[model samples]
Target chain A: QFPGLANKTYFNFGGQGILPTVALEAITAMYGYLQENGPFSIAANQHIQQLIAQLRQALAETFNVDPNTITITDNVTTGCDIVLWGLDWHQGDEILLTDCEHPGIIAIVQAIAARFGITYRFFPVAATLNQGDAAAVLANHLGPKTRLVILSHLLWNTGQVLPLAEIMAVCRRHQGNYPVRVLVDGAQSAGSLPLDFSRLEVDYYAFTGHKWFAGPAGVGGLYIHGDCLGEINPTYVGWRSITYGAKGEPTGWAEGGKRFEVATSAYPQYAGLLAALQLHQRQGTAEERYQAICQRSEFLWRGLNQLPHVHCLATSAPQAGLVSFTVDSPLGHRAIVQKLEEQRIYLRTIADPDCIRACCHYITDEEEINHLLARLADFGP
Target chain B: QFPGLANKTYFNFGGQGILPTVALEAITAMYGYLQENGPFSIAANQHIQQLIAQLRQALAETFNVDPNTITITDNVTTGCDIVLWGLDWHQGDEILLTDCEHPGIIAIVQAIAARFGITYRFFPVAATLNQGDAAAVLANHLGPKTRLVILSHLLWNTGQVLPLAEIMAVCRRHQGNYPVRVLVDGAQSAGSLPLDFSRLEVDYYAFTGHKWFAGPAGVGGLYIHGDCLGEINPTYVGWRSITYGAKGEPTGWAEGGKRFEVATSAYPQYAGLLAALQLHQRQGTAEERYQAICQRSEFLWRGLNQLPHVHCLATSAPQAGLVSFTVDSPLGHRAIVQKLEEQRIYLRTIADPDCIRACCHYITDEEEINHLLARLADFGP
Candidate 1:
């Protein structure tokens, strides 16, 4: 458990996970090394390169994807934005996103449409998410003009885990040579779920380390399937994307996902991310972590629904760590949250479908869930 | 002085500044606080927001610009790319750049030209840089079609300072409505020069904190003139760029330079950058730091010029902390850098105009300069 949660019953991992102490130590150690030895020095750079390679390997193993396809990014927003921009969009082309998608991705899609005349349509998966046919509902909305499908692996608003593999299958069935390039926003799913990007069949899986991964900010991962490498163009090219031949002439790209990378950034942040991954591995297997989160969330879900005027938002049990709910009382969600803030308990409110969300990570306990529910009971009608 | 330079002679501040220990401490402290208190908690978010405001204020004060014009970026490359892509490029539009521009910026400009059918031409400032007429040469390159004049405030390759103010005046005279937008790459200038973004009157001045600023790598600053805010569109929109009214309806942009920012990133990284700015202030005034660096570099410049078969790559004296030179011997630049690596000495080589460059920051002293000079003498023909 994070040290920051010692004084409060914390439940906002979806916003940003608590940085593990080991991760902080890793960042501090590398930062010290960077300052003492010169961040760009031969020795310092070699260590940085090693850290990048190690993180890539760890992430690849975690997601069951090839290491070469992993490109380090600053956050999930950056990862998703890069993939959205890297696509070749014609005037009439359309992108399919879910109503439950995070605003971070939604804003980028809007900009693309406004700038490139590329249209986007939302598939209303939130209505039928718990019915276990979310993909079928999304499939019915697909059309010939739908060149791309973007949806979250774990919906940020409703806390439902979509069947992304089935959705990709539906996308491929409707398309031709390249098929519909599917981009999965893995921000909520990455460290919390038992992930295998290779089996997911998505063209891009954009993830961040700072959320469920419990790492420092400014470090994330973008896994571009090797097959889709030819389909997407490099969005923002710099020294990392290009390879120089003898005489410093631009030869071609550096291979795989690196082509999508921007220029030089702080490398010590990656060390923090690497330490987070290591901590996750040492704690438990992905399946073990997933089950632990599910247990805690289910307990909270059942407890909240039993209370008068307190309704859990999901029609069924959550498939991820998030549990969203709303009070049937006249008090606004913000007002309810402010009341809870007075009690040393922490969570967040989402506005799109007005609900308060609490996250139940592996570290979350049954006692904490009961404490949060008790506080809500005090404010109930 | 940075502890990393204790064992090794570090002359690569231009590549990436040696991080100060205080900056690392700030990052660690914030990271710990973020984890222990719940990163997304009401109190924690308030703290994160405060850190951002403090960093913005510090950066604005350092650069003598309004805080509203300062947009936080990941690096100079990302800042420049946003500006390049934000412009309304049309076929036959021209962008004028200097020959000494860093490849990072040059690559993005090349991509923009290829995608938008715009053309770019280089002003050969390398030849006139030492003669103190770099801006005059660049002025001659400006034409009616020149929509932009993009060049570094201090040339990375030649270590020469360009007259940005005079160049901006020349640009305004050549155009009718919408004077030619000027973008200054401040990689080599921000911390080394006494900057006044307001007085300079450049449309966009892109800078990174990791280099001469002695900050963490992941954070940087982009100064967009308030007037030009209306002209440059937000290249990458995210949650940070949009303002939500009641019921989560997107009202409009946040305001000023916030429109240019993307979504969530490692918030602790800004703490590191904040510490760096504080450290710089505690050391001395900008003028004092500038003088310290200039005097040490001048000493190195003179020392190298007097050596037999050794020639400094300048027609006259240097204007900043950077000193570029080449050996009269046939040894490759990389070979020389590698040889010095054996002695735990750090510097860098530029490939465009093959030469070795040494950076003299306030941390660098005469003893270290002489030690570097002695090593070069041993390697000379």
Candidate 2:
């Protein structure tokens, strides 16, 4: 069993990865230790330190980065908040992102843009019929004022994996003479795929454990390249970050990714996440899991293609486990969702094209796919 | 089994409440559904919707406000971010806060203050003999330029409950003559003490589940009093906040608290929070919880009083669960923490004062309290 995947198909790993049974157990054990011994005692000394170290290692392994560079955060949105609000952007400087961006990232960028008088620009996804159109679309939008390119490795709304390497190259070439930074929202990509941040070489990579990695909801990860470490300061902090010495004194927070993390109580869910990660490891090796996701995605994509009146929204361009499509039938996305719900076959609808999206992970089998298809077949024109 | 609190002498409940067994089961159930189904479908379905409603209701009931006024944010910092950033603060406008404030709130305020050239003024916790000095401090500092009083109801660093009613009166008197608004950080106070936002009459009140309420870490509550709701616009919109065909092609977000909540992937942790509320109730109502905490705090305070080198740093104010004392011993705060660790006593050392903070929660029993003191006695230099 994919312990994290549980008994369900757990297709929403795209939204929030299921915590594996082992991770849950490990954290539960940590909780038991803390509860049995209390959080501050000698008994929790090695355990707390060990768990923190393990969490860092797991994130590093998942992101393919130095563990020290990966500072923990509460969620992907908080990760966005840290980078967007922490960065040093001057007025009139432009920040570029894909038109189809997660609303969380967009909201932060928009707010910051307004606050700092920076320009916000969106590059289109090249909706139809053209080789290199997306690149051209991005190129056309690039201007002298473009100081940063903010893009997602995998789109949260549409499941399309943007040509991030290509986008990074364009930004690199653009920065050959100027100074433009690349910030990648790795929220959807990090735990779901084999990520190589070194090769990817983005200025900021933000992720959360709740999604795809399926650790827990409150924990997120931020990877700041060593160069930008001191440049971005921790605007949000708690007692955990600093050295507590005297009554009412100020202490500096830890350097590196630690600066990005805000002060809040550390969640015990990390215990669960640790166990979940181990269980995930036991369920399938990275290559095996990746292959399963790829195969399942292709199978679902083909099944979706065969359905009449259903037009696929995001094409398979180095895709992962999800596909978004719109139905031409009178039933529409809502009716499609309802009918499928009746059959206990579930998927979600997206707004851009008023379409439905089906995301399947390892736990999803052929029978579930067929059941979903049969339910769709029963829908009226 | 206090379900989750058995993990420690969980004084850090101020950070996140322990998850209840019921909530854990619900989360597992949701994860199963998501695994078997998919995020797209499950998030759009009733299961996720009910979870959201339950969280909102729990927050509403706890705050003694209309359920409609409560918005679920990732955490209170995010809640505060939306509020502070969403406001139309003019350059040179002023924000007031206390000296003993969490860096999380201060950092954000300072960032905005520095960016916009707004002024931030701070007040210290007054001596007990100088009670009502809160009003005096505010009166002396209040001016036409002061736009908001951003203070905490319970000081996280000091464990002193601010004389909010008196301070609110000061704010009202100032507002009656000037243009200032009131915002209270109920982070440490909510669920720890009984609260009624309607009765409190503050323009803004912020709270979180992860703290004294003993809920999951991912959830927090924001109260933009009915009167102040329209004054601020939401800069923290997520896809979850937008409706497909609400008015004309998904016109923005819902008017009040709904606008503040952004995209959150379905997390079962909120169910744990609901369970925490029930646990909080069964453990004893809020009043009983407060009484138990105060009694334990008194015991710890008295115990520390007997220690030659340890003197209560916050003797001037009425405090709650937290009992902080400077470790004048040769061992120092860090050493003291290490010593406490040897005994499995989980306490924290605050940097500013170089003092160690030992906090108690409702779940903390007399035996645990005595055990901590006995260990401290041996650990003390």
Candidate 3:
């Protein structure tokens, strides 16, 4: 059970999730256990290493990926940073990205372009939210020099869930010879969507545990497809990222995804994440949980459309949980968010689209959605 | 008080410190508080940001550095990785480091050298533990194109505390024109010694709170000197690292050391760190902590010398708390560590110099040192 939800109307699952009691207790208990034994003693180190393995295994099983393909990251931003920096950028290399990507990813791309003499172009994924094909639009935007394509599996601003399989196929066939790999920002989609990375041809997927997964913050994982594993080098590295030689000196990168791992994470949080993932698995199958989330989003979307002067951003009803809409009121997006917070309801406003985003989750119900809609009705024209 | 120490004798402060009860509880409490309220509510976000500020401020006051120059990092290795990656590198830009530097830093330098056509040279700081002019030796090793110099303030293996002022002066006057910046790995010295980065000429100092400070893991900070702050760019970046435009789009980097910070740390650990710092302050001054640590280290060193076939690494008595020595035992280095772990006394074996390192802290007493020495006496020739 989440204590935060008991006291407030929470809709910001895309931003950060409420930690279930299981994870909170698991984290706290792990910390105590390490202290009760010596924190860095042989026993404690083994426990930590075991927890690391366990967390990776749990994430792998949940997403249907090989455990060795995952590296524990702090969040989606750091995960993206590792993947972006690891690539060998040539002077004329270009990166194609959707405008719907998060500001953090864009900032990193900008830095890369400046540093490596690389360039980037943004296709209008926002325009594709209401109309147009995202896959076709993105395919046309891809150039001969385009080395990577940055896309969010689920668009954070408008709840537009892009078809990953279709996009991957487009990327594969781009320019007939160019291999434009995909790096999905799974910040909003990681836990909400029933992911099967085994079936997908994605090169990289960076996801966080603290968003839709309801795990504590500061923990996430990156999945590097085995095909491109060697191509991605370890840029932000540490002891955990290195393998040893005959003389105990660090020789080369560690095997698989562990090569990207840096040193000394919140080790106890690994237990917290595994516990949270376990809790998610207990609540029916992953698909059933996602279906319930879309059910709530449809309920919220229909209710918002009923209100006067309210414009729901999505053309069709949201297949994803994020319901972005604009309010025609004297008070704008910021004020709507402020008003909602003052009423003990949690929602976030987006800067790019100039809209307010209400993130629905499987944890949310029709009653809560109705309550949010009633509050928004008071501010509408 | 530490529950870990209560259970067993801990000699691995160099490995990791036992989390104080205050810090442990503070961390658990903060996590619960976040969940009880909203994890990403306006109130919660503000709370997390304030905690971040508070952490930087506390670390600033403790280290005698400007609060504006410190960035919270996951650990020492990540801090170093950030600083190293942020620097502008040319093909032949060289990095001068000590032979005694951590493997993680060396691994990163190796990657950098491979990525950019760079080179690194290691001078003998390991030998300087006995009798040598480390500053002069390092100066002699510096090349004309040396861009950066990496050294640990306290050598992790031999407990040799390097002279910061003299070594920094060596780097400053090198070839009279080349600005070979220094990045000090403060892993062993952060909590064990009094630091004044304001007075020091060092460009960057990376340290973790979890080692010598008796704080929980997953938290540390990097100090970038004000003079060279603008020279360093952020490599591992996130939303927290950037400033925003008028339209709320990210425009440039956030000012000062926050520019280097990436997204979403185990935020509750920031509270844990400040709490741990407070506990250390309450015990006595930083100088007082160092004095008590050396007192125990000297006792252990003298006790080790009294035994047959024992060789102390340092020529003079330890000015710092680390006491490294070699024992002519039938069992090898790994076995000694194994036997010691079995006996519930913790010490680590060094790879390069082939020595056993016993770390002392203010929490350690002469009685504890005597107990450790007594245990080691049994393994001697």
Candidate 4:
């Protein structure tokens, strides 16, 4: 169903998922519909609202939270930016983060720190991936001045799933002078994991639609808990974020998540994301999809461990879709990705861990896993 | 070629332009290409960079500015927000604006003023649109505390083209205690007018792709003059805005306009915009397009004036593409739109001045203008 998956054996779903044909067509079709209906007329505007509403409801059902908490954004990074800048930071405040967060996020936090005289520290989550307790390590790192704690629900570099429930509980019990709020980057976890934000009780969770969901890029969301809604203010203002008076002048902020949105998004892509999410649900429940993804990831993880010169990052089978390993080869990680890419196989190399990562999804098959293992033998030490 | 223009007369191009078929197909094709190649692989990353570079060059050529000054953004409002927040503000700093700026821009200015203890005032450009000098009106509004002045290049409601050269010159020679920097909202002007940002020498110009350019929404840009580069700071930061050291750590900001970009945009839509722009160029030059649009707009303006109770906003034939008029009728302005819409003619009602605005383009034909005027005669006084 994916035009991107026609001839290649793909293992880079963690980076950007190749969209399905149906979802791609949905976008172009919506563009046509928007035009025929008068792009800015009442009809097209209502349709745009409907598509956005459907997306919010679908994402809410997936996360098990209220739809009012979802604010549509461009990407996970943009959503994280909203959370980073919305809160008022006084001088000397500290932001705690995990060592394995993406550089895209670190750059924003760094900018905000420089602006507000705030400081950020990276706790050692990368060191505790294989056998150590991540929650315990994070609990020890929380300081009196730590106002915000940010970490990925699933690490990007290593294929390790964080103990998110325990981590959130730790933050819940923390005795910081300012109440420690948790923001989880769900770029890698949204489609792969069975999430229940209602039970998780995280302050903020940012997720992207393009990767694990296999939707179009440029459309993602941020979920703010009902309790934390007043703690953050909207940073970017436009017609979409404000309420209008009877005379059409801006009166004040709109209600809930809509107030965080700015003007004129890629509205057609909303249709694409809604289609992709519906297709994912039509196959099976989240638990079934989760089990299927694990089956394929474990197959790839076990196959790499069979190689004497290769070292899988995880000690046991993978709980999620990503499987990262370091190869004992003079060819090096950079050369390894290029070599595989030439043979119509795709994977990515992580800069920090200095290893190659192969992402497997429900779409991955056993035949591809066998082929990937055989290809690794050619460059094995 | 627009699938949306198949069965109706569209007079709302200012609201949102209906994309051509060639541009629509280009987007879907690019999505497939991103998948077949690795979306995040070295090859695809280079392709994304190349597409962005090409877009900047095309826009630079369109605006007659150096390509290095352009920062790709999401829309006109996002670009304006960047400029609004980028500058350092002091308490009691005055931000002056014209009366005809979009609600999106007004919302941002209002938000910034509230956040920074700054004040904003709107000078009466609307009163001088039909006769009097706008530049003189603006010059009188500059004060000792005036820091920034913003106005639409073309007034949205009345469709009057501004004397931008005289306006820019006025701001340049101001004797205010604070330097009065200028930011022009080019949402309606970017594709309609032949722009020369270098010659105009405005501090910032924000434009969109979806309006007069007839490209997809969700993509736009801002141009900053080299002299004013140090006057503003980057409001949003991500991997796109940062330079990296050898050890894979963010060293500092990227050079020039690239420092203002954030993460993961709608990369495929870039292809659509480039194709639309190239197609626009293939037909005629900007001057030719402008003249053709004026011919059609004048045709409508003259026909509407023949009706006894219709009053055109501009006393003379429109110099640009928009034709706004008020009609004497028992039916309200809202119903006027519905009346024309029922006859397969499309137009929009403006909140201020209580009138109907019909947007004309080079693509507009003489027959459609004739048909629109005759339809308005159905409910004429």
Candidate 5:
């Protein structure tokens, strides 16, 4: 059983998921082995290399792609930074973004725009996705000067799934002679849905394992298509970035997505992540887990929508694990969160766009949903 | 207890130091807490921030510098990369380096020179440090356009202690109207020496905790002088790099050296590092530990020098933990290392300048040194 939810009605998996007992045990065992044998000896290096390879292969299997296209990093922010800095941006280049993006990525774009002369434009997706065709709303903002478009597979603030394939097709139609690339932030969608990046054909998709995969912190994956490998040069170079000859002559960058890796990370986390992946696989098939998560999310959305004081953001029922809402009652958003915390129920508050967000995963039960609803009914003036 | 050296006489602390039992226990305990309290919850975030603050304060104490000037990074390579890229380098700017530098920093310089139009020059530190005045030899190579001078406090290849203070003084004298900075790679010096960066006044010093500090991997510290803070802008920006207002408005970069940190790292490693630092302090004072380590290294150097087939690169006894020597016998470097491994005695071979390297820490007993010498006596033809 998941240990974090044992005592409390926890619903903050959107921030960081509950790690399984098996993953913790794996980390303990690996730490013991690292101390017994040296952490940087020849044998230890070989073991670490094997563990990284295994993790990369596992991620590739999850995305239904080749291992060569996947690169492991510490977090989703680093993956986005790699792609953002690696691209060749010129003055007046256009980067179209949506208002639903997380600050983790919006900050990077601000820094880049200040350094280079690229322009950024944002469109409101929360209301547009609810009212009419989401892809057409996004396509209306694209132009000939657009060099890149950034969108999320699942909006973190609104919990609404975007029309990704339609948006990419729109990008291609509006693209001029210059290559127009699509970068997808998969932070909220990687583990919540069964994914196949090979079929998706997006230029870049960055994901974190701790959000929904229930892996250890400081470990994530970035998928870069093979066709775009030449365009995105490595921004950071080190001992691990290139191949070495016998006399330590630097050859070109290593094949595929490994050109982006930083040097000398903690290796025990790899074992922990692999165990989490195994635990997820052993629970059930990906389809079954996704369906279970969707069912629970739908149940929570319906129950919360029936309250007169509550206002759900999504026009339709929930499509993912997250559900966002605002309260029209006397209690503010923070007060409601505090009241729920006192009742041993946890949720997060989004500050930029003020809202309360709750995550309902496959592990969540009907009783927990009912308890959250019961607490919300009593949280009034 | 130090379990890595329990069975084998490990002399490879130069690569990665043996992890103590307390550090492993600390990591395991923190991992369990993360699962129970949720990794990104309010309680968990507060605990993580406290742990990181303690580790940074501890590192500042070890270096005899202010806590505000220190930034925690993953490794020395990252620290060096941040400084290298953060600086405003012109096309024809020059960088002066030593011949005894590690490949980690050397590779970064190579990448920068290829991307930017900078030039790099080197002087032979191994021969000059052994024979003549090292500061004079290094100063002879410095020119008006030399923007940065890179060297190590303790040479990793030859274990020679460089004249760092004198070199910095010479750099100050040679500096023109432009800023001339000194970058010291402290991979071998942090826990092996009683350091005072405040008195040294070096612009930057990058160090790793896993080497001499006996901490976990993927955690290290970088010291940046307050005067140079304005010049070295942060190359990588994220959630931790700058403070945001309640409405998520981006303020200026955070005060002091924290502007260099990437986002979202493994929190358990901070607990592990703090425990490692505590274990070290509980063992002995810094002066006491340094004296013990120097005594062991001197003893090993003398014993190895007495052998007819051994040739140590150092003209005098080692002043640090590492001792490097090459054999004039029939066995190659790899063969000698493999032969020692078979006898349960561990050491490493350096390929750049072919040699066999061994480390002598405070925990290394005289009996272990004698055993290593005994094995070397029978390793030749």
Candidate 6:
């Protein structure tokens, strides 16, 4: 529908969301208000209040979780920080994840894990994918010592949506005896695919608006199930979280999601994110976007396989907006990237994957794919 | 020189830098790139590397510290999170901050202090003309268990510059006897005033680019002095912070400034901040901007005093762009703000000082001041 998108393909919704024209216009309005007024007065404006509420509701609607269960954050990193650092851990308790994870979660979680001297473990990425083959690989790794299974729903590198339902059932089955909590880092999954908290049965699901949600950076949300709310203590507490009901002292934290919120949210971004989400809702449901993004991704993947010196990952990858391929070239990875930049075909090198990822989005098309291949031909060995 | 400034009597610079035509154009260019290319590839592109380098150099130049000492962060709170949570604190140690400090520092430090069972203390906002007030207050409070002092150089609520130089000297005098570090939250003072870290012997100084520097919101810088650099570990360590190096094993951290940095930075904001800093540099030298801002602050002081209900918190406040005052209205402080909002005047309220703060930048003029004061007169005792 977007003619501009037709002209130049934006294949990397994996790294950051392509700011939809509507979202960009919404941000312009926000930036305009900030310039004319200030962020300080945003709370005073009812329009801003309505906008923030809409954003929260939109996020809440996506997960089908209670609206009170979500609190908007700066990014996936911030959501990961809240959930990772906020959780109460004992020294011997174990934290498990897949080997393929974003630095955003790993960094803060590692910090807290170190502080408590917790036993940390990782399952293999290739084996725990959404299909049966991966389920066996993940099941073999899970044992009684695992206190918390912290895994992303989809691998960012490979864009393979893990069999989260099976994994959640595995976690549920272990709950009574071993008590291993499941936390899904929904960085690539939430907006890219359908996610219903009721069905997933995960303790915590952290998702970002910027990536697949087609919103601004520095805005994301975390969903905490009803029962686990009080058990987990928030590391970051502020006036927002602290209830002012008592005479002088803060009596306690607000019930549910407000307990997770810290002080001074960036209101403008919230407003912008809300507008983007509204635009997304009007465009289509998550199922529609998910299918479209997957189709685009597979199209690009098949196209890349035809290119010389390109080796695509996975025998049969899960349908997603993410695809990865390695260039079998004497020329270094850095040189490959340098030449791609020269042609104005931007891409990223996954350091761990040791490959170039040509992530696709709904905004991508056939001509852009052709152009990308032509550019690769111009530079590939 | 800016005709737009004349059209509207601008006064929101302290909250966010009013983007110049050039900054707006720069952001548009980045947006254009995002539209022309997909965000995933373009967001990670190092096209703005020069702009980022310029910001690093400009921040270092502003503080008269080595450029290598400064590292970019998201905002003041994010920077504080890196420092407060990053540091090693024992259960019995104490952290000191003034009540007049910004919520960004006070709120986070308090949370960390409480979590670690560390004692938190506050120095009073002394209404004294002497530069030694804060230093004297801290001297009296200092004890054997005091491990760190986390006070703002300029009080966000009270609009008073703390005697940081005197306080540093006090710390030096007591350091041999009691080993405690000093961390100055220079969020208000950094781009707003002349902050020369070469002269100030503090362990850490943190500030943001968005507030006074007119950069985009999602970026700031922090300075960790050489001695404390190794001692204050990062609670958060991302891939960027550590070098993979030739060994393939993650090498020790990249030296100095690199040690403090975490994760893939918001490079777009880095570009905006660089342009804003250049604009700040051209607007005048540090001293020149400092003088102009102080002059405008003085105007605020004099103008507010002429109003019937207005009363400032500090009887002997230092000359600065920020001003704080309580209105002697029958209604509460919030109502006073509402009345001002009706007149399209934007301001913020501080709970600590129990007053409203009007943070003036040099861009603010006499017209905005007159309108604010005229709006205040409609209030009854």
Chain A only TM-scores, each candidate in turn: 0.96, 0.90, 0.98, 0.98, 0.97, 0.91
Best by DockQ: 3
Q: DockQ, in order, for the candidates?
A: 0.65, 0.30, 0.78, 0.70, 0.62, 0.31
Q: lDDT of model 2 at residue A125?
A: 79
Tens digit of per-residue lDDT, candidate 4, span A294-328: 99999888889888988998998887998989999
Q: Which stretches of candidate 1 lie over 4 Å from their true place?
A: A130-132, A175-178, B175-178
Candidate 1, clashing residue pairs? A3-B36, A4-B36, A4-B37, A5-B36, A36-B4, A217-B266, A218-B266
lDDT of each: 0.83, 0.67, 0.88, 0.87, 0.83, 0.70
Question: What digit string (tens of lDDT, one per residue) describes model 2 on residues A1-381?
Answer: 345333333345665665556655664565556546544344554566677778878877766778878887666776766677767778988888887667657766766777778988888873622245565677778888888778777776567777777776777677432467778888777766767778767788877777677675557678888887766755444434454334544355555666555444344676666666666677787668777877787787777778886666655532777777777776667767766655555566666645677776666677767666656655445
Query: Per-residue lDDT for B123-174 in model 2, tens only?
Result: 7663422255776777778877888878888766667777788887887777
The runs of at least 3 residues in candidate 5 whose Cα sits more than 4 Å from the true structure, single-residue gaps closed, are none
Model 6, B96-185: lDDT tens per residue?
776566544555765776688888878775444334577888888877788788787776766777777888878777843347788777
lDDT of 1 at B211: 92
lDDT of 6 at A229: 77
lDDT over C-alpha atoms for residue A68 of model 6: 84
User: What ranking emerges by TM-score with the best candidate at the front?
Assistant: 4, 3, 5, 1, 6, 2
TM-score of each: 0.96, 0.84, 0.98, 0.98, 0.97, 0.89
Could you give candidate 1's per-residue lDDT for residues A9-37 as a string of tens digits?
88888888877778877877887777666
Clashing pairs in 5: none
Report backbone clashes per prediction: 7, 48, 1, 0, 0, 6
Candidate 5 lDDT over A250-292, as tens digits, reads 6668777787886777778878788898889899988899999
lDDT of 4 by residue, B1-381 (tens): 767776788898898888888888888777867876777677888888999999989988888888889998888888898888888888899999998888878888888887788999998888876789999998888898999999999888989888888988888799877778889999888899888776667789998898899889888889999888877777777779888876578888888889889988888888888888888888799889999999999999999999888889888899798899998988888998987887778898998868999999999988888888888888756
Tell me how much of the true interface, by contacts, candidate 1 captures: 0.65
- Encode model 5's per-residue lDDT on B1-381: one tens digit a residue: 787777878888878888888888888888878766666667777788888888889988877888888999888778888888788777888998898877657777877786678999887887764688779988788787889999999988888889988988888888564667898998899888878877667789988888888888878889998888777867776777887788665676776777787788877887888888889989889889999999999999999988877888876878889999998767699888887777777788887578999999999999999998887877554
- TM-score of decoy 3: 0.98
Q: What share of the true interface contacts does each candidate keep?
A: 0.65, 0.25, 0.77, 0.61, 0.49, 0.25
TM-score of chain B of 1: 0.97
